[PDB]
Amino acid sequence: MYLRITNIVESSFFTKFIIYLIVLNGITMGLETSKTFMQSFGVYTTLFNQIVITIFTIEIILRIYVHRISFFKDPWSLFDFFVVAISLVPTSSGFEILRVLRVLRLFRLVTAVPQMRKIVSALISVIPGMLSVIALMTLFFYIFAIMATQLFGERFPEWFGTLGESFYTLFQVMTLDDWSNGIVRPLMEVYPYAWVFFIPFIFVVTFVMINLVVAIIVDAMAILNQKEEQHIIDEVQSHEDNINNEIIKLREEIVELKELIKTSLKN
Amino acid sequence: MYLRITNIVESSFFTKFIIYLIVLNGITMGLETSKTFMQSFGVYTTLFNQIVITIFTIEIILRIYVHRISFFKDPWSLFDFFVVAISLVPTSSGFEILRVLRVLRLFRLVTAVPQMRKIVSALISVIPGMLSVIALMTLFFYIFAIMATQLFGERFPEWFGTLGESFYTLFQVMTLDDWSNGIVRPLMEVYPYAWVFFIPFIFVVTFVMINLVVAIIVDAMAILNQKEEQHIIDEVQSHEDNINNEIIKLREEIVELKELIKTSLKN
Amino acid sequence: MYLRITNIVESSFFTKFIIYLIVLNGITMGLETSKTFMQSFGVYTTLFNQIVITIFTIEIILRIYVHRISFFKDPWSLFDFFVVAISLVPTSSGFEILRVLRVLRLFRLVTAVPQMRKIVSALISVIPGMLSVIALMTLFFYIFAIMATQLFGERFPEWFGTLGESFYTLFQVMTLDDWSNGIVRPLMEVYPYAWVFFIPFIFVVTFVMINLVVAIIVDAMAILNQKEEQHIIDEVQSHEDNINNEIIKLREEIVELKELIKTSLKN
Amino acid sequence: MYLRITNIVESSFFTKFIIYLIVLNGITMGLETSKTFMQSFGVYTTLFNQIVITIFTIEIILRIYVHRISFFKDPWSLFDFFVVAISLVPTSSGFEILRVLRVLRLFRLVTAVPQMRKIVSALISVIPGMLSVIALMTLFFYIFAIMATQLFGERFPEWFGTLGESFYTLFQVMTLDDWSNGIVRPLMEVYPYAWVFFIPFIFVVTFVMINLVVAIIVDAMAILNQKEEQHIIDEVQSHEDNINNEIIKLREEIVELKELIKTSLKN
Ligand SMILES: C[C@H](CCC(=O)NCCC[N+](C)(C)CCCS(=O)(=O)[O-])[C@H]1CC[C@H]2[C@@H]3[C@H](O)C[C@@H]4C[C@H](O)CC[C@]4(C)[C@H]3C[C@H](O)[C@]12C
Ligand SMILES: C[C@H](CCC(=O)NCCC[N+](C)(C)CCCS(=O)(=O)[O-])[C@H]1CC[C@H]2[C@@H]3[C@H](O)C[C@@H]4C[C@H](O)CC[C@]4(C)[C@H]3C[C@H](O)[C@]12C
Ligand SMILES: C[C@H](CCC(=O)NCCC[N+](C)(C)CCCS(=O)(=O)[O-])[C@H]1CC[C@H]2[C@@H]3[C@H](O)C[C@@H]4C[C@H](O)CC[C@]4(C)[C@H]3C[C@H](O)[C@]12C
Ligand SMILES: C[C@H](CCC(=O)NCCC[N+](C)(C)CCCS(=O)(=O)[O-])[C@H]1CC[C@H]2[C@@H]3[C@H](O)C[C@@H]4C[C@H](O)CC[C@]4(C)[C@H]3C[C@H](O)[C@]12C
Ligand SMILES: C[C@H](CCC(=O)NCCC[N+](C)(C)CCCS(=O)(=O)[O-])[C@H]1CC[C@H]2[C@@H]3[C@H](O)C[C@@H]4C[C@H](O)CC[C@]4(C)[C@H]3C[C@H](O)[C@]12C
Ligand SMILES: C[C@H](CCC(=O)NCCC[N+](C)(C)CCCS(=O)(=O)[O-])[C@H]1CC[C@H]2[C@@H]3[C@H](O)C[C@@H]4C[C@H](O)CC[C@]4(C)[C@H]3C[C@H](O)[C@]12C
Ligand SMILES: [Ca+2]
Ligand SMILES: [Ca+2]
Ligand SMILES: [Ca+2]
């Protein structure tokens, strides 16, 4: 069975077929957005849906047989797995968010197209080196969220009532979103020094952001420089090695000229 | 006989005449916004617009005569054509929006001045490399527009009731424009976890934008370095040949002292 | 006589004195904003002002004596002149504006501290290359402001009633300042397709800005690379001269014996 | 007593222990944000807070006997010192700002974890270089703050009534926060030319921000290219001397080919 399966799964027809289904299913999901469309064609697309997820379920199964344990070490396959699994949770449930979580299957367009994987992968590649700064930042947010909650939560429960609330508001302030007329001018009417809290906050988060970006650019180009430097330097020291080695064969060719005469009379 | 007219079209005087017209018609169109001006002088100015529109139409004709098919595969000319043709439809119609489009004709200043031409050209040229990421992003908006229509379009039809609406709203949020007090805080009064939707959306969308720019700057530098790697490397292996050929003149000079120095040593 | 003055004006005491007067003047001008401070013992300050204005006028005359015609080819000195100038015109009634323009004379601390002068200078030096992109963007605003007045000014005269008002509003939008809930959502309630105007506008205007920053950085690095690839090439061709010169005479240690041993055959 | 104490504070056990106490205290401090929690667990965590403060204090004392004079010239230990000191001030007072400042001691996670220090340290090194730009900007605000107060203060005391208030409003305008519908448009209802003040303000503060960033980037790369140039020119430095040492050595062995020619002269 294996090779018979393996050769259908690995084919140029298979993945092409899936992509095509994904794109159709994606057009189909936009149409289900229009209740007008749904009362006039909804039955056609409610099962187009149901059989596409059938095909994807089958595809997922075959691919597991064809790849066995190496399937679940694949980030992309793992995603396909979970994003399909989700659509298998019953279309009528107590948790009804999962029905909307079904739309994530359109991200298989990313999974199955290598230009897209390329993009995404490039994007992800910058993150591991940011985690420490992510960390420093989250710790910064958390300390200030605690302070803001103790300082402002009593009189301003909506914005600062709760740590989670102060977290939310501090993010808002970070995005510079209606932070003065909308948040701290109102705070200052009760707490005139509130600006000594939020303006340093704004300096720090903005400083950290910019410099992260700056640091990325500059450190990338410092590696590009090093890699270029060695090339130039290898070429300089294989080419100036010859001019050194060629003159030595002349410094030598004259000392052997010299001896030829050093054994002239002698005898 | 192309050539009789062809020398007129290619002349310094034809182009400068048109640029002079554009800048004049452009001054004209401004004053046409003043309602008081259109009393005291509206008739003079409608005249000028009709004159200019004629002149422009002729110049396009000549230019098609001179350039023939090469005219309709030149984007600059295509734009001049589509912007002049538009400007020729009757000022009173069913869709009178075209009356407003004829101000686009002022962009011929860009089109006719090579300095400007080159700016616009430089700007356009980052786009083809980007088309993939623009596609990722559009797909991203689209998936999120659908989810957002479903999650919030019932209670918030103005912001999310229709897919286009969710799109519009999602763009506003990307620009960070009044996104918390104006959209998300309202949403959370009905849907307390709505921050689980918009804050990741903001993270992804900002992250992509920043990394696109970063990736442009770093990779531009990379090729700036590749070619200066090759200029330097080509010169150290050129200079070596300059030392080399005036060292092959110390080769013959001692292989000729090689042939004849034991000859000088006779008995 | 000229030198006796010149040696005063050029001394580290003249400049220290003026800088000192500038900081004091700048401290009192802040104090003058307080009406408390102003009524009780604020007549002291009004005369201090007139003492400083004369001293600066003296400073300027002397400086014109010392530097003569080259004074007025100095942008820093010109700035100094005109800034002290407007502070000389009397507190003419109904010219209330010039009273506050006087404050512009604290920009002399910039004019007079070499460190300040250098940042400012560096900042100015970015501009001459940009004047094309500036022109392009200005024209772009003009075309859009004309279209906007025409499309939106009868129904939204505060925002768009006038070319001027339209420029102002398009600038607000460019800064993404309350652009959607505050301008475009209201517009769309009369004109549902208004998003076809502002969203493209926002794309172009933001695209042009990012790329202007991008192209500055990158083209700077190109120039930075052009310089370092020159120094390398010049230090490579550097000793190539005196190496090829010292071994064409090392070819002449052998070239002589064309006659030193061949004439020995002629005994 | 020393080494024994020294073997304690230098141990991997010591640091790990107090890092765990930081993280633990960090969690309990989040919990103290809850009124529910504080009610039925408060005395449990108010003690833990007292416990931790003592331990950090003995820790600070020990680290001092081990490091002594060096300790007080260590910025991280100075920080450590001072946020522990703050927590050592008694809560009972009129000034209860200090009870909130206690949670600053959680920044000790920054001082205690080397990848943290490294990032904070990287961030800081940016600052001394840009202090001159900061002085320029602060000056610019001050001058404009003064003009603002005198121009708009009487009619708009909330935003401009006072030097300090204008500073605040001008900072809001610089972050582009609700600057037009929120501040400048209202102002233009009384003062139609107010845009002649705020749009230049926006242009300058934006320009300077962007350019500062562009400057850090371009100048960091200028420096990288200098190190790179030297290292490369250093290579051309070593190698174009050892080919002139092989020349002198070629001459020193060719100055044997005029006195060993002295073996001719026989016939
Ligand atoms: C810890 C740093 C950020 C901290 C910071 O803010 N650093 C100061 C920067 C330079 N300054 C301009 C201040 C110059 C000062 C003097 S200098 O002589 O440089 O001019 C981290 C955060 C994310 C990291 C990078 C990314 O993961 C991606 C990338 C992966 C590659 O594996 C190699 C590098 C690279 C570029 C990473 C570099 C660096 O690991 C980064 C910037
Ligand atoms: C517009 C410019 C400049 C000069 C020019 O070509 N002006 C045409 C006038 C018509 N004439 C009758 C005078 C010549 C007819 C025959 S002739 O083929 O010898 O042109 C002409 C120069 C040579 C032309 C291209 C190339 O050829 C190659 C290429 C052929 C393809 O098809 C399509 C495109 C393409 C890129 C051409 C485009 C363009 O059109 C070009 C750029
Ligand atoms: C798809 C990529 C962008 C995706 C991305 O995010 N890419 C790299 C990550 C960079 N990081 C520093 C994060 C990785 C760390 C390791 S690294 O070794 O970078 O230090 C695309 C987007 C736009 C593209 C360019 C532009 O059209 C312009 C330009 C045209 C020229 O014809 C030559 C290339 C160039 C520079 C294009 C290169 C590249 O086609 C780009 C960046
Ligand atoms: C060239 C541009 C305008 C034209 C343009 O819009 N250029 C876009 C390049 C797009 N990309 C970078 C993607 C190309 C990558 C493909 S490529 O194959 O390059 O990798 C102009 C506008 C502003 C100018 C600079 C500034 O005055 C400052 C500065 C002054 C100095 O006097 C010298 C340089 C410098 C850096 C100026 C250089 C440049 O004159 C600039 C960038
Ligand atoms: C550490 C160095 C020198 C190295 C050393 O070793 N110093 C003595 C400790 C010796 N041991 C640890 C070997 C003994 C424990 C024996 S055991 O059987 O317990 O392991 C010496 C140099 C300077 C000395 C101190 C100062 O003058 C003054 C100072 C006053 C204080 O108010 C009390 C003591 C104190 C701290 C002094 C302690 C110690 O003198 C110091 C730190
Ligand atoms: C005062 C200057 C800012 C001046 C400015 O605003 N702009 C320069 C013009 C850039 N342009 C491209 C326009 C030049 C055009 C021609 S050019 O072709 O020469 O590029 C200051 C502000 C911040 C300073 C740096 C940082 O502390 C970090 C860093 C520390 C390191 O210890 C060494 C360098 C470095 C990069 C510092 C360099 C520089 O001391 C900076 C940029
Ligand atoms: Ca905003
Ligand atoms: Ca380089
Ligand atoms: Ca707003």
**What domains, with CATH codes, occur in chain B?**
1-113 (1.20.120.350), 114-267 (1.10.287.70)
C194-201 long-range contacts (CB < 8 A, ≥24 apart) are C194/C151, C194/C152, C195/B168, C197/C144, C197/C147, C197/C148, C197/C151, C198/C173, C199/B171, C201/C144, C201/C170, C201/C173, C201/C174
Of B29, B213, B264, the CB nearest to C261: B264
Q: Is the CB of B70 under 6 A from ligand 2?
A: yes
Report residue C21 as tokens: 């007067």
Report the alpha-carbon distance of residue D229 to residue C227 in Å, rounded: 10
Of B208, B233, B265, the CB nearest to A232: B233
Report the alpha-carbon distance of residue B119 to residue B117 in Å, rounded: 6
Residue (of D171, C44, A85, A38) closest to B149 by Cα position: A38
Please tell me the experimental approach by which this structure was elucidated.
X-ray
Residue (of C104, A195, C111) closest to D197 by Cα position: C104
| Ligand 9 geometric centre to CA of D180 (Å) | 9
Of A149, A221, A251, the CB nearest to D246: A251
- The verdict on a CB contact (< 8 Å) between B149 and A33 is yes
Ligand 4 mutation pick, B121, B126, B226, B228, max ligand atoms within 8 A of CB: B126
| Contact of C175 with D176, CB cutoff 8 Å | yes
End-to-end CA distance of chain B: 93
Resolution of the structure, angstroms: 2.7
- The verdict on a CB contact (< 8 Å) between D178 and C175 is no
Report the alpha-carbon distance of residue D142 to residue C107 in Å, rounded: 10
Report the alpha-carbon distance of residue C191 to residue C176 in Å, rounded: 20
Instruction: Identify the nearest ligand to the CA of A229 by its number.
Output: 8
- SS3 letters across chain A: CHHHHHHHHCCHHHHHHHHHHHHHHHHHHHHCCCHHHHHHHHHHHHHHHHHHHHHHHHHHHHHHHHHHHHHHHCHHHHHHHHHHHHCCCCCCCCCCCCCCHHHHHHHHHHHHCHHHHHHHHHHHHCCHHHHHHHHHHHHHHHHHHHHHHHHHCCCCHHHHCCHHHHHHHHHHHHCCCCCHHHHHHHHHHHCCCHHHHHHHHHHHHHHHHHHHHHHHHHHHHHHHHHHHHHHHHHHHHHHHHHHHHHHHHHHHHHHHHHHHHHCCCCC
> Distances from the Cα of C101 to the Cαs of B108, C83, C104, C138, in angstroms?
41, 9, 6, 28
Instruction: Identify the nearest ligand to the CA of B228 by its number.
Output: 8
Show residues of chain D in contact with C216, CB under 8 Å.
214, 218
| Contact of A171 with A178, CB cutoff 8 Å | no
Q: 3-state DSSP helix/strand/coil percent for chain C, to nearest 5?
A: 80, 0, 20
- The verdict on a CB contact (< 8 Å) between A247 and D250 is yes
Exposure of D250 by Cβ count < 10 A (0-12 exposed, 13-18 middle, 19+ buried)?
A: buried
Report the alpha-carbon distance of residue D84 to residue B7 in Å, rounded: 86
All residues at 6 or more sequence positions from C147 whose CB lies less than 8 Å from its CB, including other chains: B100, B103, C197
Report the alpha-carbon distance of residue B170 to residue B166 in Å, rounded: 6
Phi first, then psi: what are they for C95, rounded to 5°?
-110, 40
| Ligand 7 geometric centre to CA of A50 (Å) | 44
Residue (of D20, D18, D10, D108) closest to D65 by Cα position: D10
All residues at 6 or more sequence positions from A107 whose CB lies less than 8 Å from its CB, including other chains: A79, A83, B139, B143
Other residues' Cβ atoms within 10 Å of the Cβ of residue C61 = 10
Exposure of A2 by Cβ count < 10 A (0-12 exposed, 13-18 middle, 19+ buried)?
A: exposed
Show residues of chain C in contact with B34, CB under 8 Å.
163
Instruction: Identify the nearest ligand to the CA of A215 by its number.
Output: 1
Report the alpha-carbon distance of residue A12 to residue B115 in Å, rounded: 49
Residue (of A241, B254, D246) closest to C246 by Cα position: D246
- The verdict on a CB contact (< 8 Å) between B132 and A122 is no
Residue (of A45, A41, A47, A49) closest to A103 by Cα position: A49
Other residues' Cβ atoms within 10 Å of the Cβ of residue C203 = 11
What's the number of CA atoms in the CB half-sphere (13 Å) around residue C200? Answer: 7
Report residue D78 as tokens: 């100075």
> What distance in Å separates residue A239's CA from the closest CA in chain B?
7
Give the nearest chain D residue to A163 (CA atoms). Answer: D33
Chains contacting D (3+ CB pairs below 8 angstroms): A, B, C
Report the alpha-carbon distance of residue A164 to residue A145 in Å, rounded: 8
Residue written as tokens 């007593």?
A: D1
Measured at the CA of C179, the angle between CA C189 and CA C150, to 5 degrees, comes to 60
Instruction: Identify the nearest ligand to the CA of A209 by its number.
Output: 1
Q: Is the CB of B7 under 6 A from ligand 2?
A: no
> Distances from the Cα of C35 to the Cαs of A242, C32, C40, C114, D155, in angstroms?
84, 7, 9, 35, 15
| Contact of B123 with C208, CB cutoff 8 Å | yes
Ligand 6 mutation pick, D137, D216, D217, D225, max ligand atoms within 8 A of CB: D216
- List CB-based neighbours of ion ligand 9 within 5 Å: A 178; B 178; C 178; D 178
What's the number of CA atoms in the CB half-sphere (13 Å) around residue D61? Answer: 6
Q: Is the CB of D101 under 6 A from ligand 1?
A: no
- Residues of B in CB contact (< 8 Å) with D are 221, 232, 236, 243, 264, 266
Report residue A132 as tokens: 């420490």
Of D149, D195, D210, the CB nearest to C168: D195
| Ligand 3 geometric centre to CA of B216 (Å) | 5
Q: Which amino acid is residue D222, in one-letter code?
A: A
**Cα Rg of chain A (Å, integer):** 33
Report the alpha-carbon distance of residue C221 to residue D216 in Å, rounded: 12
Of D135, D218, D233, the CB nearest to C235: D233
Report the alpha-carbon distance of residue A13 to residue A20 in Å, rounded: 10
Report the alpha-carbon distance of residue B200 to residue C157 in Å, rounded: 39
Report the alpha-carbon distance of residue D41 to residue D46 in Å, rounded: 9
Alpha-helix residue ranges (DSSP H) falling in C107-174: 108-112, 114-125, 127-152, 157-160, 163-174
Residue (of D179, D187, D168) closest to A185 by Cα position: D168
Q: A194-262 and D114-152 are packed helices; what angle lies between their axes, rounded to 10 degrees?
A: 130
B240, B255, B262, B266, best to mutate vs chain A, most A CBs in 10 Å? B240
> What distance in Å separates residue D178's CA from the closest CA in chain C?
6
> What distance in Å separates residue B170's CA from the closest CA in chain A?
15
All residues at 6 or more sequence positions from D254 whose CB lies less than 8 Å from its CB, including other chains: A254, C250, C253
Phi first, then psi: what are they for A22, rounded to 5°?
-60, -45
